[PDB]
Every structure is written in C-alpha cells, then in structure tokens.
Design a protein around this ligand. Structure first.
Ligand SMILES: NS(=O)(=O)c1ccc(SCc2ccc(Cl)cc2)s1
Ligand SMILES: [Zn+2]
Length: 257
C-alpha cells in the first residue's frame, strides 16, 4: 500500500495513481510576489456554529476528526466558491522536526504542520460523487507554527493516546473547529487536487495567510502517533506530507493586497 516511507512515499505514488503527474496537482509553493490580488474575490464565509463532530480515527496516514455531514450544519461558502460546501472532516500533516511538515509552502518556507478542513459541494449529493468533479471539494488549509499553545487544539491532542495505531477510533463529540482558526481569513486560492492517493483533481484550495501557533508540546504529541497497527513494529507517524508539485498552467490568487 501507499504511505510516506522510503519505499512507498510520494515519489512512488504515480505507479498506482498516474494522475500524480497531472496538470493540477497539490500542494504547491505559493510565490507570494507572483500571486495576484483579485479584488473580485469575496470574503470567505465559514459557518461552523452548528458543527457536530462525531469521531476521531487514526487511518494509518493521519488522524481524521469526522463530522456529521448529513445536513448543512458546518459549511464553507463565498471566497472563490460558487455554492455551498459541507464540512466532512479535518486532519493535519506534520513533520519529524519543526522545520518541515506543511504541504503548501510560502516562498519555499515550510511550516511545522498544516491543517486541512475538507468540505464537499452539496450540489453533488455525497462526498464520493463530489470527488469526481473539478469543483467537488473545497479544502481550507491553515499553517501551524510552533510557539504559544493553541488552547482549542488541546482536546484533540489529549485524545491521541486513545488512537495511537492504525484503525483505532474514539468518540469525539462536541468539538468546535472554530478554535483552530487564526484571527484573519485572508487567503490564497488555486485549483488543485487531493494530496494523498487517489490524488483526484477535484479541489478548490483556500490557504489562509495567517498561521496558527501551537506549542512544542502539542506537536510532540502528534509525533507520538503510529502509522502501524496495534502490535506491529512501531513507525512513528511523522513526515506525512507530500512535497510541492509543479504549478503548470495555474494562477494563485490572493484575497488581500
Ligand atoms: N489532504 S487533502 O487533500 O485534504 C485530502 C486527501 C484525501 C481526502 S479524503 C480521501 C478520499 C478520497 C476519495 C474517497 Cl471516494 C474517500 C476518501 S482530503
Ligand atoms: Zn490533507
């Protein structure tokens, strides 16, 4: 199976998922000087007051915090988007060391981690249908830097010891994802893909400019997770990021001057 190791990592993925070498792959480097301010972009609308978290799952690649997406409870709209996109899950990508971990980069800078809030376009009815469409998903990406703790992250951190290994899940209700946002919703946006297999070219990416800060201690607990299943040789869950891919024929737009 695919993963992040030496033998099954990003440089191998194209052998089973040829779209890995496609024309709208993610992540990318965001060249801040080349990104054009687009005064026609809207403020984003992040409506998470009725979000219903259900469960957290170690899927062998990351951990996903899952939401009830059976009604418009937690939705993303506006910005570059047409229509309404429902929150299904969030997850992170992180490094073995603070100097790497993000998937997007900003003028080649790597952040310690990157949060992805994954949303699907309601016009397609369910997530599986959405990922087959070029405007099927909207992923809100937020960089993490190490400094002061993020108080709204600690609930997530504290449940990680209960889902150490692949396939473990735990009940995770009443978690408010608004506590993971930065102050500003200034963003860059471009058309891209999933950053893991199957690498489908179905995402409008919205990457916030302002990182959140989390503590060393919080990230260290991410790095205690395991890629392996229970009882299997321990492989720490670290460096679960895909590097930047060719920009090709795409324009990154900025919401801000
Ligand atoms: N890291 S990311 O681009 O946000 C991300 C990669 C993978 C997803 S959900 C993966 C997947 C894709 C297709 C199906 Cl049908 C079920 C799950 S979001
Ligand atoms: Zn992701």
């Amino acid at each position: 199976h695919w993963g992040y190791g030496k033998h099954n990592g990003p440089e191998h993925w194209h052998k089973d998922f040829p779209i890995a070498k496609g024309e709208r792959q993610s992540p990318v480097d965001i060249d801040t000087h080349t990104a054009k301010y687009d005064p026609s972009l809207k403020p984003l609308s992040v409506s998470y007051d009725q979000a219903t978290s259900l469960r957290i799952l170690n899927n062998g690649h990351a951990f996903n915090v899952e939401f009830d997406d059976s009604q418009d409870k937690a939705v993303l709209k506006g910005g570059p988007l047409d229509g309404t996109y429902r929150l299904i899950q969030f997850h992170f990508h992180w490094g073995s060391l603070d100097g790497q971990g993000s998937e997007h980069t900003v003028d080649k800078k790597k952040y310690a981690a990157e949060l992805h809030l994954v949303h699907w376009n309601t016009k397609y009815g369910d997530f599986g249908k959405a990922v087959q469409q070029p405007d099927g998903l909207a992923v809100l990406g937020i960089f993490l830097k190490v400094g002061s703790a993020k108080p709204g992250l600690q609930k997530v951190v504290d449940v990680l010891d209960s889902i150490k290994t692949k396939g473990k899940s735990a009940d995770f209700t009443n978690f408010d994802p608004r506590g993971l946002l930065p102050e500003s919703l200034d963003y860059w946006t471009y058309p891209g893909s999933l950053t893991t297999p199957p690498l489908l070219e179905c995402v409008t990416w919205i990457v916030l400019k302002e990182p959140i800060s989390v503590s060393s201690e919080q990230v260290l607990k991410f790095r205690k997770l395991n890629f392996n299943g229970e009882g299997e040789p321990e492989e720490l869950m670290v460096d679960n990021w895909r590097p930047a891919q060719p920009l090709k024929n795409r324009q990154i737009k900025a919401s801000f001057k």
